[PDB]
């Protein structure tokens, strides 16, 4: 649902709040799960965009 740029804003604010190292473990670690979801989710969308250009730019039949 969220745009690709809002994904980078979400990950940015997660990494910033975490790196200060001032949260409870059961909270900080539980949020670490979301971080890998956004990074894994965002990465996949760039797999689909990177491939579309190659098919569109190369002389595909």
């Amino acid at each position: 649902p969220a745009s690709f740029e809002k994904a980078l804003s979400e990950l940015e604010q997660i990494v910033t709040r975490l790196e200060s190292g001032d949260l409870p473990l059961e909270e900080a670690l539980n949020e670490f799960e979301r971080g890998v979801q956004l990074a894994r989710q965002g990465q996949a969308k760039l797999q689909q965009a990177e491939q579309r250009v190659q098919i569109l730019l190369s002389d595909n039949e």
Binding site: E19, V36, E50
Partner: protein, 87 residues
């Protein structure tokens, strides 16, 4: 632009792993330190030694007619064992 965006997320995914690995190893080292301290309780302060200088760690060795010498931080005190109450 896309290859630039792939590099951004790759860079940030590493900071995320290096941040948590640091937090976790800090708590393991402090907890592991605290358990060894609790274990470091050895016998469970004074030392009781027989006249010959040979230690007694099982009360039944005593002969009830000997002048045991007990060494404390400041010095030692001596007395003759006379009665026993095993538990």
């Amino acid at each position: 632009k896309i290859h630039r965006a792939q590099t951004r997320i790759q860079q940030l995914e590493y900071r995320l792993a290096e941040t948590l690995r640091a937090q976790l190893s800090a708590t393991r080292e402090r907890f592991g330190n605290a358990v060894t301290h609790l274990e470091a309780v050895s016998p469970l302060y004074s030392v009781t030694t027989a006249t010959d200088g040979n230690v007694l760690k099982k009360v039944k060795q005593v002969k009830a007619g000997e002048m045991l010498t007990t060494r404390l931080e400041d010095g030692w005190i001596e007395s003759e064992v006379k009665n026993i109450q095993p538990v």
